Each structure stands twice: as structure tokens, then as C-alpha cells.
Amino acid sequence: PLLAVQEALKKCFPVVEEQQGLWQSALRDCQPLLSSLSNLAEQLQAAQNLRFEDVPALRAFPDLKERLRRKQLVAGDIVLDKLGERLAILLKVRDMVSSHVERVFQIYEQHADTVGIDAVLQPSAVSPSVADMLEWLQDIERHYRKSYLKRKYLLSSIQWGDLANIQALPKAWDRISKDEHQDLVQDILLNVSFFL
Amino acid sequence: GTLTVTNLLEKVDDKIPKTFQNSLIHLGLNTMKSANICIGRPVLLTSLNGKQEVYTAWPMAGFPGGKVGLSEMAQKNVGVRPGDAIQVQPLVGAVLQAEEMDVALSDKDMEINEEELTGCILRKLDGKIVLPGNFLYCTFYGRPYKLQVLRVKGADGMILAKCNTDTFYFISSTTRVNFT
Amino acid sequence: TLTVTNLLEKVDDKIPKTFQNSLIHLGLNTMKSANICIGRPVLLTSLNGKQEVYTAWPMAGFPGGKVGLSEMAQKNVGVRPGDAIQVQPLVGAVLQAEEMDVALSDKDMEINEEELTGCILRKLDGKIVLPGNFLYCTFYGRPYKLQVLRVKGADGMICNTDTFYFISSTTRVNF
Amino acid sequence: SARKIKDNAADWHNLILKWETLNDAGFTTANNIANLKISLNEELEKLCEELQATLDGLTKIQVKMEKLSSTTKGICELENYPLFHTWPTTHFYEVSHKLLEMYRKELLLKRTVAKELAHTGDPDLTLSYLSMWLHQPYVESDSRLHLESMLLETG
């Protein structure tokens, strides 16, 4: 009966908690790498505003521009592959939580013929509602998916050859996070704590 | 249906909703069960002087029965003291969004940048259901304020609320405020 | 002439990723049997007739008398775990390939030849290659496989005792 | 004989390590100089002096590894009239010679960036110079690999 849906929710939530923690640590690692990458791109942007044959000392040298550029790009490539790894971990958490939420909804739609909608709307003393809990699960899956898919189409528009965009990256990245409801995961967790 | 007002025993590091942070009438679990309370739902407060104000109940553990520890500012705006009696009711009526709310300043007349204070009040007081003639508190950069609301108008159509089963209103990010 | 397993999982933090890719793994006796020499390019051949070069390396705790190979190795040669191979310590003269023909993956969704050749040249510093073989690059994660058509040696010079050629910043790329 | 070669290997390792460490310290110094310059005397002077001292430590390292190279070449020649794991032992000299050439040209570039860092104009030169100091743009990465490989054949 309805106890099945209740058990489903009690099962689904702690997963959401731990996954949120993982997401958080991932993005936390992600930040300073991207800072360093901005710095690298700037330093490179500088080193093509010269002629490297119209400065006296450097002149007594066969070729610097080429070798230095090659080294700079190797460093950049390494740091960007680190970012790629982080993005992979993000993808993992998205897919996992989406599968779980879908399982919950499917259980409900399986049973929602003997549990009158009215019984879905009994806010007890220590439990908001099965209704609002399903709603919040739905909203949390949407939040995760949109955040992930908006972070990718930012991180994969990096091309050595647009050295303004890279140098601007960190601000755009940080901004991608200051437009959701951080309270989403935080308050959902709190708000449903007493349910356990 | 009747409880003993105390002062909030505040130590809430992880005090949950980084929102309810303003309404916050704490309670006790069994007290919730007695008065049909339920988390996150509003609740009506009636004083022995005929003043009223509502608040989002919250069952923070670590409290004894009958001690519905309010906040100091509620204790002022409704005029109670730590030990009196008060009437608690579980709100049942409608709850809509409120478009027009007009309100005048206290004697701190410095003519602050109008829309700026609007921005602060909104970004600080989501969900605080209001009534005619109450007081709000939005510490806009340390500098406190104290506002007296006169009339409010909600999208449904009426314009201002003494009993429980009837209209109310609250402030959302699409509310208009007048300063007169 | 030795049997082929799959490459192990005991990768070293040293020898940065780039070279970590191009490698084959061996054991001590495997080194001291065909008398090959560490860090020196080595030739592999299948019975089908696929010859491919790599950089040999003996890894600690390798199962004696075997040779591990990369997944991309097994692909580019066409051998499965348990199969045999023909290993040869390269003793010819290795030189610097001047210019090299390339065949794309032909799914060219607006490929920037300058950028492509830059990335290729970069991620393939020490790499000898014979025609008809293939290359694997990671143009920002999105992988690419390239096919080699012809090779022009330094001295116009287009068997484990012949000459072979690697890549360098000066080598030109043609399509 | 081969014992000396193994010693040469371990010395290569520790020498390059000390190199990197001193380069780190010098990079900090050069940052200080660039900032102090951009902000607008004798303070700057003491700075340049201790930077030159860093360069001299570098030079000491260079001469030690050059001696390493020479002894290796000597043993190479003396083996005229084969090892742990069957290397040509000429290969050894080839390795050490590539290493030496790399690091020596590197030292020259460091010397020029010191020689110029004090009085520079437009800041973009300054960034490019700090770069030249840090990224060591004359040390092809495989070097470490090379060393490792050689280092591998003698524990």
C-alpha cells in the first residue's frame, strides 16, 4: 500500500544526500584548476604580442616563440584533461540520481489507483506529504540535469585561438552556479530530515 | 489550542530552511501533534489583547510541551512576554500571492533609495505572510528599519483577516510596494 | 615470437601520460630472450601481415614469457588475448620524417587543418610510423583516428634492419 | 666501471631535482622584481644580487653535470678494449650528451632573462620573460623518460 511509496522515499533520499556531497566535492576540486587555466591562457596571449626578432637579447637565438608556445600548450592540455575527468564524475552523479528518481516515480504511478489523492495530501506532524516529496524529487532531478548540461556546453567551447574567452572563463563558470537554489538540496534534506 | 509563550532557545547552526529563517516559531513534536501542526505550514497567533500574526511553524527538537518559543520580534509586534498565554491555530484557509502592499517608514526619515529598499525587503522577507498594520525588519547593511504596513492587495481581488479560515497574502518576488 | 596478453593496470606516475599511451609491457626474461633494449623502439608483427612499432618497457611483476599490448594495439594489429606475435628489437637507422600524408576520419565536421596538425604534431612527439598505419589523437576529448598514406624521409627515402622515421615539430602534414 | 655509471645515474637524478628547486626559488625572486618594477632603488639592487647568486648555484650544478658527462664519455672510450641488462653503453653517453646539451642551452636562456629582467618596458615582455623562466622552454619532456629508462637499467 501507501507504505510502499513511503519506503521508496525513505530509500531514495539518502542516496540524494551522499550524491550531493560527491557533486559538491567535485566542483570544489574543479574551481582552482580552472583558475590556473585562465592564468595560463593569459600568459600565452601575452607571448604572441611580440615579434621575438625585434628585441636585442632574444635575437641571438634561433627560435623561442615556437618552443615556448609548444610547452605552454602542453601544460594547458594537461590541466584541461583534469577538468575533463571532473566533468566525467559530474556525469556519473547526474545519471545515477536520475535513474533513482525515475524508479520512485514509477513505483508511485504503479500504485496510484488505490491510494486516493486525498491520502496523498495528509501533512502529518513530522512529514510534509507524499505529494510534496514526489514534487521535490522531480525538482531535484531537473536541477541536477540542467546544471550538468549547462556546465558542459560551457567547458567544451574552449579553443586555443580565442584567448579572450579562456581568460574570461572563471567568471562565467562561477556565474553558472549563482543562479540556482542552493537551498534546493540543502533545504530538501533538512525539510525531510525528521522523516527518518 | 493554547500555549505558554517563552523566548526561543536559539542554537541553530543547521537550523534547516535557509528561508524560514525569518518566520521561525519553534515548537515541540508532541505539541505539533496536539495542535494538528505540520512542518512548513503557516500558523496563526492570537494574543490576549486582540492582536494577531502568523508564522511558519517549525518543530525544532529539544523543547518541552506548551512552550511555543517565538522570536523576540514576534513578542513585540504582538505584545507578549516570556511566560504569558497565546492562542495557536493551524492555518486552513487559502493562501495567495500578494501584488500591492503599501507601507510607511518609522522616524528614521533619510529618504533611502526607494527601489533599493524594495530589493532588500523582497530578497529578505519571502514567505512572510502579512496583515494590515504589522512591522517588518530588514537589516539592509546593518542599518535597521521598521515599517508599518497600511493596505495590501492580492491578485485574487480583495483588499486588506481575524479568524483562521479566510484569505491571507504573502510577499513574492513580484510584489509591488508603496511608501507613503 | 611470443604470446600476447592484455596490457596490465600497474601504470607509473612517471613517464607522463603521452608516453604512457605508446607502450608495450614485458618481463625481465622477455627482455633477455630476444635481447631487446629498454626504451628503444621495437617492432611487432602479426601472422596476417600487420607490422607496427612501439616503445618496449619491462614492467615489474610481468607474467614471464608473455607480451602485453594496448587495446588500441590489439585493434591496429588484429590479435586477441592469448594470441602470438612476432617481436623484433629494432636495429635499423631511425631518422626524422620530413613530410607525411594523412587521411582523415572523413567525418570532417569543419576540421581546422592548422589546429588539427598542431594537436597531432604535439601529442605525437616520439612516434615512428609506417604507411597504412593509423594514429589516435584527442582533439579536446573528441577522439580522432587518422590514416597515413605516404611518408617522405629526410633524404627523400619514401624488415627489422631498414630505416624508419619519427615525427617532430618540423615535419609537415599533407592531406 | 659500471659502478661509476650507476653513480652517474643517481647523480643525474638528484642534480636535476636540485635544479628544479633552485629554479622555483629564482622564479619567486623574479616575481618580486617584476612587481617592484611595475610599482614605479637599492632594494631592487639587493634583489638582483641574490638572483645572480641563484644563477651561480645553477652554474655550479652545470659544471658538476658537465664533469659527469666527461667521465661517462671516458668510460665509453675505455670500454673499447656487456652490462646488467644489455645496453650498448654508448647509448649511455648519447643520453648524457643530450641531457647536457639541453640543460646548458637552458642555462644560457636563464642567463639572458636575468640580464634583461631588471629594466624592461612594456609589461608583455615581462610576462613572456617570467614564462621563459618558469616553463624552461629547452627541456623536451621525454628527457625525464630518457633518464628514467636509463635510471631503470641500474635500479
Curated annotation (Swiss-Prot), chain C:
Effect of F164I: Reduces protein stability
Superkingdom to which the source organism belongs: Eukaryota
Coiled coil: none
Protein function: ATP-dependent chaperone part of the 55LCC heterohexameric ATPase complex which is chromatin-associated and promotes replisome proteostasis to maintain replication fork progression and genome stability. Required for replication fork progression, sister chromatid cohesion, and chromosome stability. The ATPase activity is specifically enhanced by replication fork DNA and is coupled to cysteine protease-dependent cleavage of replisome substrates in response to replication fork damage.
Region Required for interaction with AFG2B and CINP, residue ranges: 1-158
Gene symbol of the encoding locus: AFG2A
Domain notes: The first ATP-binding region binds ATP with low affinity whereas the second ATP-binding region binds ATP with high affinity.
Descriptive protein name: ATPase family gene 2 protein homolog A
Swiss-Prot record, chain D:
Listed result of changing L109R: Loss of interaction with AFG2A and AFG2B
Compartmental location: Nucleus
InterPro entries: Cyclin-dep_Kinase_2_interact
Keyword Cell division applies: yes
GO cellular component, one term: nucleus
Record's subunit section: Homodimer. Part of the 55LCC heterohexameric ATPase complex composed at least of AIRIM, AFG2A, AFG2B and CINP. Interacts with AIRIM. Interacts with CDK2 and CDC7. Interacts with the components of the replication complex, MCM2, MCM3, MCM4, MCM5, MCM6, MCM7 and with ORC2-containing complexes. Interacts with ATRIP. Interacts with CEP152. Associates with pre-60S ribosomal particles.
Family statement drawn from the similarity comment of this UniProt entry: Belongs to the CINP family.
Organism, as annotated: Homo sapiens
Protein name: Cyclin-dependent kinase 2-interacting protein
Post-translational modification note: Phosphorylated by CDC7 but not by CDK2.
Single GO BP term: DNA replication
Outcome recorded upon mutating S128R: Strongly decreases interaction with AFG2A and AFG2B
Keywords: Acetylation, Cell cycle, Cell division, Coiled coil, DNA damage, DNA repair, DNA replication, Nucleus, Phosphoprotein, Ribosome biogenesis
Coiled coil: 41-63
Binding site for Na(+): S149
A Gene Ontology molecular function term of the record: preribosome binding
Function summary: Component of the DNA replication complex, which interacts with two kinases, CDK2 and CDC7, thereby providing a functional and physical link between CDK2 and CDC7 during firing of the origins of replication. Regulates ATR-mediated checkpoint signaling in response to DNA damage. Part of the 55LCC heterohexameric ATPase complex which is chromatin-associated and promotes replisome proteostasis to maintain replication fork progression and genome stability. Required for replication fork progression, sister chromatid cohesion, and chromosome stability.
